[PDB]
Design a protein around this nucleic acid. Structure first.
Length: 314
DNA sequence: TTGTCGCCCTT
DNA sequence: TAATAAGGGCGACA
């Protein structure tokens, strides 16, 4: 994986474009098959044959913020997507332990890291909010879970509203009713009398990483799971409620819309970067809608988990 | 003795 | 559209 430097359709071994590579160099095969976007500068193209480019990183260049941007081949992306099946199943098998951890700690002291993590984990499994790295709060004013501040928590005598601007300037509103098990512990954690402070003031990126490590997943996996679970809940409800029934094609489209709105991102992004491919393939089958119809949601969730488990050949 | 930071990869 | 932005995860650094 030698680094080669790109400039105006031709390739060099040199930082400042003296000394061009060989004419027959395999990298030129790659350049026939991909277009370097012209908004980039300092473009590096990796010397390899097209067939190997397919499978991994292809080139990287700097956008106008000065950020390094990374471009991958179609096989790399395919493997990426194929992983969502296993993640969905993986999270599903640790939910019982996650809840167990949550409920052990939510009766604890207000400034206990474990109590704070418990709440963190319960907001996450409830609303699928992104991790919220400090970095993006400084750079872009983006708030996610870890970067939530007391000003983002509005208290009413019957509900708590969490309101904040997340990724891509998208505005989010989540609501916690009195009956919700998040009410009591969230009201206890937040301090009205200092709005400029972080909600999870005893946590940090490192604390979260260490804590989640025990379930063998990453916070983003909780979000990937939440999107699939919500899809399944809506799909199940839709089949269960909607006048005779539309085509599976349109039933998936509706379920994806509903799910995307709950989660708060576009339908296209939901289908493409979140949904387990097997679920998407499984639900197309018309005969399968008979199966769904006669089930409680729990036995439905199980059928899907099982099929994804074993169609994944594991 | 821990809060940034770069690199890679994801959305 | 057609052009191409901004998130997370992990480990090194002082």
């Amino acid at each position: 994986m030698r680094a080669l430097f790109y400039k105006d359709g031709k390739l060099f071994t040199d930082n400042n474009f003296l000394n061009p590579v060989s004419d027959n160099n395999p990298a030129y095969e790659v350049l026939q098959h991909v277009k370097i976007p012209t908004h980039l500068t300092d473009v590096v193209v990796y010397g390899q044959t097209w067939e190997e480019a397919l499978t991994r990183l292809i080139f990287v260049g700097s956008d106008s913020k000065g950020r390094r941007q990374y471009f991958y081949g179609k096989m790399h992306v395919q493997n990426r997507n194929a992983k969502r099946d296993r993640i969905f199943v993986r999270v599903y098998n640790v939910m019982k332990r996650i809840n167990s951890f949550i409920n052990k700690n939510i009766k604890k002291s207000s400034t206990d890291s474990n109590y704070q993590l418990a709440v963190f984990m319960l907001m996450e499994t409830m609303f699928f909010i992104r991790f919220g790295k400090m970095k993006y709060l400084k750079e872009n004013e983006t708030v996610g879970l870890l970067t939530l501040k007391n000003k983002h928590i509005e208290i009413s005598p019957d509900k708590i509203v969490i309101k904040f601007v997340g990724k891509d300037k998208v505005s989010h509103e989540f609501v916690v009713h009195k009956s919700n098990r998040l009410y009591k512990p969230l009201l206890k954690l937040t301090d009205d009398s200092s709005p400029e402070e972080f909600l999870f003031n005893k946590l940090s990126e490192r604390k979260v990483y260490e804590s989640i490590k025990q379930f063998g997943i990453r916070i983003k996996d909780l979000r990937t799971y939440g999107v699939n679970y919500t899809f399944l809940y809506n799909f199940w409800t839709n089949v269960k409620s909607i006048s005779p029934l539309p085509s599976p094609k349109k039933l998936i489209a509706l379920t994806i819309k509903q799910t995307a709105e709950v989660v708060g991102h576009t339908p296209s992004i939901s289908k493409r970067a979140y949904m387990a491919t097997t679920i998407l393939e499984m639900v197309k089958d018309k005969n399968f809608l008979d199966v769904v119809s006669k089930t409680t949601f729990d036995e439905f969730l199980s059928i899907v988990v099982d099929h994804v488990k074993s169609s994944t050949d594991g």
